[PDB]
Symmetry: C4
Subunit: 293 residues, 4 copies
Amino acid sequence: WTILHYSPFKAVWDWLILLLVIYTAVFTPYSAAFLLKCQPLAVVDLIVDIMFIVDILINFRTTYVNEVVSHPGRIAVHYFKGWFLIDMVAAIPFDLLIFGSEELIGLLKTARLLRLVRVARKLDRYSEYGAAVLFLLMCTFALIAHWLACIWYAIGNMEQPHMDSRIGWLHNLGDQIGKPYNSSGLGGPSIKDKYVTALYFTFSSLTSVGFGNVSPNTNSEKIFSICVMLIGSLMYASIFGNVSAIIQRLYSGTARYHTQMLRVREFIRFHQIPNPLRQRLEEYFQHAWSYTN
Amino acid sequence: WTILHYSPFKAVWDWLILLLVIYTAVFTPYSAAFLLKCQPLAVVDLIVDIMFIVDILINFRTTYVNEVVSHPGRIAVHYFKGWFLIDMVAAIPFDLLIFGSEELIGLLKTARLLRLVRVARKLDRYSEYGAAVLFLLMCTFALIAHWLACIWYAIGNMEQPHMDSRIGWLHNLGDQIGKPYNSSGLGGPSIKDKYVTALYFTFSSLTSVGFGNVSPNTNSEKIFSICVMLIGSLMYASIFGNVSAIIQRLYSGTARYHTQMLRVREFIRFHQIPNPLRQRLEEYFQHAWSYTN
Amino acid sequence: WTILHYSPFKAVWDWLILLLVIYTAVFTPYSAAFLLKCQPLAVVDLIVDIMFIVDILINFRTTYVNEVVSHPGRIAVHYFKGWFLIDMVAAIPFDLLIFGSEELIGLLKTARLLRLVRVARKLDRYSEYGAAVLFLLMCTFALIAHWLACIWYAIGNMEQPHMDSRIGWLHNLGDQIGKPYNSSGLGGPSIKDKYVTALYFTFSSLTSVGFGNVSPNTNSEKIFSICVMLIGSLMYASIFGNVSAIIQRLYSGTARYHTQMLRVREFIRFHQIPNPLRQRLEEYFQHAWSYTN
Amino acid sequence: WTILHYSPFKAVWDWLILLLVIYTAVFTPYSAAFLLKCQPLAVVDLIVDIMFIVDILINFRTTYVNEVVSHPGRIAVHYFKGWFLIDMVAAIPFDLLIFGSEELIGLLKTARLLRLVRVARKLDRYSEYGAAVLFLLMCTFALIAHWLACIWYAIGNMEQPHMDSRIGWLHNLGDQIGKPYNSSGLGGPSIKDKYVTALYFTFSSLTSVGFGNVSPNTNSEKIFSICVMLIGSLMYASIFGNVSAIIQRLYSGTARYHTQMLRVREFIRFHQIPNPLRQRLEEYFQHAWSYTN
């Protein structure tokens, strides 16, 4: 057997894999930055890795446009010429492959971020609807804020063993919430306090609010903040350009309607059309527009 | 008898009900957030509830387009099979109906915010005039900034009995204005000091100024500011996109005029037209424009 | 004799009166806010009051379009039935007329801000040129920032005799620059330190930077800052909308050129035009473009 | 011999001189602000000054358009009646000419900033490609942010020997990073700490984040910040106006495609086309578009 790329199954499967790419893009950077020194986030990662492997089996059993191609030999050779290498590197079980330090095993699973390429391959499906691309733009924005929160925590944390003597953002967080770092390294804020503050700071830098209770203080935090300001400005010229243009695309029926209504009303005022005739003109435009848009 | 939906009474009544929906959108969230534990606002809420009940009787005695339907049975069944459920729920006298704690009696009146649906139903009347839709957009911005100020006060206040040990924004307000909270729970800022500071903080986060004397410090305050940064950026792509478009629509006569003027001016440069002829061309453009628009 | 409204004298006089309106819009708010309790600014104000009086005499001797009307009686009655009242109220010298406290005598000169109406009447002269309207938009922004600096200092100063007990922005300025107010009310920042700080805070609020060393702290300063954030957002939808649109209008030759060049380039790529013919097409486009625009 | 201005050598040379102008725009303002009183930045400046002299010899031996002109006498007189004066002043070795204080000798090398004119002459070469004009816009922004960081350090540094008594931004930097100044007016932050903080402050002001741990405190720092807020708002109305327009210009193939797809989709909904015909319509649109754009 072989699966048609326009079938109602393969359409729903491509929309389901988007949610497992969004899951990967959230929980992989978080586990790589915050959690490194059954669990639901161990077994759900195993379930999700099995589905990203089943998607390789579906890619060996899908038709594709050259006219459609429907022979398993002409399907398999096209997947090997195309994306199979990137898809297999995104599927190696590195957690089972080596036992080789635990820091390397924790970091190396960031190779799963190659699963973001399974969205770039399929924008011809996902971008078709205005309400779907507006959701992808807000998830692109919230994921870029989350990835920068994981980098901002990695920067804030790596300056404690290469010790600063109480300058970097984690010491200031400890004081501001009344959970200070003791000189033994004991105490300090929880992973919720550190994550929520890092996400708050990077939405505050990207959306340009800059609240000034978290503020960058060491040179690596300042050089990171210059990079977040260069990313945030290119992104506001692009994402919140396209969200405004997509709202204007949905609103385009109303914008055209009021433009043609204003022309009809201005014509009616310029000629001072008598009421017995004017009502026939301004009712006809509403009828004709309601039929043909 | 029956009322025609285009009549000058029903037109003025639908513009009066916009001002009473704006009153409900202001003083209901304020009473639910700041005033929990006759007065002028206790009698004015009774007068306004009577007018929102009179508006239900008008909705049983108004015509609608199938042209118009003008039989009370065909009117009433259309209202029951439409908006009557929301309209009557938005008029239940919960201030009298139960005796059942006084906090819940005060909170349950927030069901009156269903009166905002009486504006969404009538955007065919309200959006027609450029100065009226520009007014609505500035009131949607000011009402969202006010509703967020009521949530920001509810968050800042509920963390005092869920005691924080002096971390949340109301303790910082007490120390900043020289009206501290005593350790006995006495003193602290007045309702004007707390409301004006809450409204100042939500305009500061929405317009992205971020003044840094009020800043979010506990995790619920930081999670709220992440939500206000997402609301504020979607609202700047939408409201201050549409306000700039309506400003350009009011400017459209001037924009067309200068665009046609530049074509005529460049034509007169390109052919180097002699003055006696140039004045005839360039005066004719001003007549033909100021006559025909 | 009588003066033609299109003459080179009346063109230069209308462009000179713009500079004396810009002078009035600067030095009247400043003298009313900062300098209350002959000099160079007193004699320049007298010279400028004489020129705004001479402009009333020119308005009694200028032609106007009904063809142009040139009889002095038909000119004078048209000016009296028009702007003469506002032009005379903007010219009555209340300072020289009076013989009742000197605070009111200094404040009453703010009637000179009616001279801003002598710009709004003449936008058909001033808005014609792209470099002139871009200058008017930047001076409208810099004058709105200056008028708000004068209101912000009037608020900050009135709360010292209506005493705050050391809360408002002037006490914090004293501590920050090392010029504290003494306990007797003696000393404190100079008029330069106070003005440059008030102008800095209002550019910081309007452009939304919010630097957080000056921040609003009493309720009148917070209510003013809410007003500046509503002014600043409507103004960024309008002024920095129109400045960007005028920059696009100045760029419109280059924008049309690249749009037609991209069409000709895309056509040449699609048909794979051989080089001997490619150069002829691609040069002819540049000749036809640079000749006719 | 003589060089044709469209040849692949002269194309590569004009793209190489853009990189040496970008190097000049970085390392000359930096050396003039931070380093006042062979190694890499002595020998690389010698190599680059020799290449800007070799470019003068190329400018005497290149063809130009009046139709092309190729006689060395008609080339040389066109360069002498054109840019040769600016190109010679941008190449005088003032460091070898004078032997009178060394502060002026170091500052006088800022004459090399006339090399920015060698980019402004050649925008007809560089602006042709959409990726190249987007790169020039981001480097124009990052170079304005760098030049303002050199002025901001010159202001912050000159008020230490013209002593402030502990007010300006460099004293605050020393206290924040754990490197306080000695009472002699000496020691404290390194050139990395001072440069990275100055560049962080000008991106913070230009992108309007305003982080509030660096803030202007003396009057020269406040007057500078008012100028940066006027430059930053004109620049965001112009540079990030153009970057968002260039992103929409690159996206114009997709924007035209989806607008034409939506017109076809709306037509197919309006007539309710049966599936055996509908597929042929929407498949033909995809063929016709992917063939001709």
